């Protein structure tokens, strides 16, 4: 019933995405970033993270990285699935992404899962080891949903990232554009 409710939720989001994110215009595209960044900001506010990095990658993938605890990976009571999978298959961003990947650094282990339109492509796996903790989310917005544009605007991202860093003092928030490998731009914000 839990996994069935998962699937019904992804169907709902993709049927009326503007009810979830405001619009499917350029403003809704950028909203995807804000939803992921806000989760990392909560982790900083909780006392566990202090660095967030937003990267516009080739082909308008977005990568958000924080140094928090790592999304948990323990098997749940409710779903019988790893906690990170439950969290990400209930995420609006995941539903509205043609592809999304997570890497969790936790328990000295690197865990990976990938999804398409919110559907896990394989079970969460251990892919490597680590001496850090935190979370990496990489997504590509689904052009079937975002029919006007899937191209991010650096200055739109920059203006809100700067605002977030100013509002959440002590969090280092970095924006980087890698879409043109020949001219990479980066702004990094860290108040007080």
* CB atoms inside a 10 Å sphere around CB 27: 12
What is the smallest separation between the CB atom of 161 and ligand 54X, expressed in angstroms?
16
Applying CB under 5 A, which part among 2-10, 29-37, 39-47, 74-82 lies near Cl ion?
A: 74-82
Q: After which residues is the chain broken (C to N over 2.5 A)?
A: none
Q: Name the β-bridge partners of 116.
A: 119
- Is position 71 an interface residue for ligand 54X (rule: CB under 6 A)? yes
H or E element, residue 94: helix 92-95
What is the smallest separation between the CB atom of 187 and Cl ion, expressed in angstroms?
33
- Is position 39 an interface residue for ligand 54X (rule: CB under 6 A)? yes
- Is position 66 an interface residue for ligand 54X (rule: CB under 6 A)? yes
Q: Which does 73 bind (CB under 5 to 8 A by kind): ligand 54X, Cl ion, none?
A: Cl ion
CA distance 67 to 44: 9
CA angle 129, 76, 133 (to 5 degrees): 30
Nearer to ligand 54X, 9 or 72 (CB): 72
């Amino acid at each position: 019933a839990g996994q069935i409710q998962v699937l019904e939720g992804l169907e709902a989001v993709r049927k009326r995405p503007g009810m979830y994110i405001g619009s499917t215009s350029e403003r809704g595209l950028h909203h995807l970033v804000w939803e992921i960044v806000d989760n990392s900001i909560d982790e900083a506010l909780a006392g566990y993270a202090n660095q967030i990095e937003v990267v516009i990658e080739k082909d308008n993938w977005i990568k958000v990285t924080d140094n928090g605890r790592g999304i948990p990976v323990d098997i749940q009571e409710k779903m019988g699935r790893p906690a990170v999978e439950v969290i990400l298959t209930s995420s609006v961003v995941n539903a509205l992404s043609q592809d999304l990947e997570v890497y969790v650094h936790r328990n000295e282990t690197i865990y990976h899962q990938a999804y398409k339109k919110g559907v896990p492509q394989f079970d969460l796996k251990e892919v490597g080891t680590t001496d850090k903790t935190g979370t990496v989310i990489r997504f590509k917005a689904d052009g079937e949903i975002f029919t006007e544009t899937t191209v991010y605007n650096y200055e739109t991202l920059q203006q809100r990232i700067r605002e977030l860093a100013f509002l959440n003092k002590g969090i280092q928030i970095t924006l980087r554009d890698e879409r043109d490998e020949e001219n990479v731009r980066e702004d990094s914000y860290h108040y007080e």
